[PDB]
Amino acid sequence: MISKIDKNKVRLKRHARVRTNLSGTAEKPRLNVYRSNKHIYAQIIDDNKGVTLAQASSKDSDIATTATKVELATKVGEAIAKKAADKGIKEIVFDRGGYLYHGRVKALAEAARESGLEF
Template structure:
């Protein structure tokens, strides 16, 4: 019998984490997507510290419109917080999700706001 959807995503996530590693100069932009919300964090893996975070639950992110529009706003919000922290480049970690839909929309929003990955 084949892998379930969750097992497949976790296998992909482990494979991505082997390659994607965040430092203080180039932190890892980790994306977590639930059915209702989307979350993004900038993580320094050397110290094990979250440098900045944004989600669709934050008050500064307008949670109006479609999930795609909200994900784009979260991407812009994390990029603004990264600029405040002096971060320009990040390593993108899609967390086992396909680079499609809300994950892609978040990445595009971050790029529009000035992050490079």
């Protein structure tokens, strides 16, 4: 009876290790990424206050559509970049959430960069 690992738990161990060294400030807030089997979520968090400033998900009505997960990640990155710009945020630090920086995570990050967030 071989056990099956909980991918989210493994991810969270990795994420806590990343977050020891990576934290978001009011002037340079942290762009956190959460990834599921279907959707991708992004927040911009000031860890000094522990408050979110902007959010964007592939599950949101504005972004939900019929596209590949990577395309949805691109759209989520663009949306979060736009909302951050509207709230007056340019510098951020990218928290890959413990996921490998690749594929959907990388597409979201590059979309935010292109939309104008300065890492």
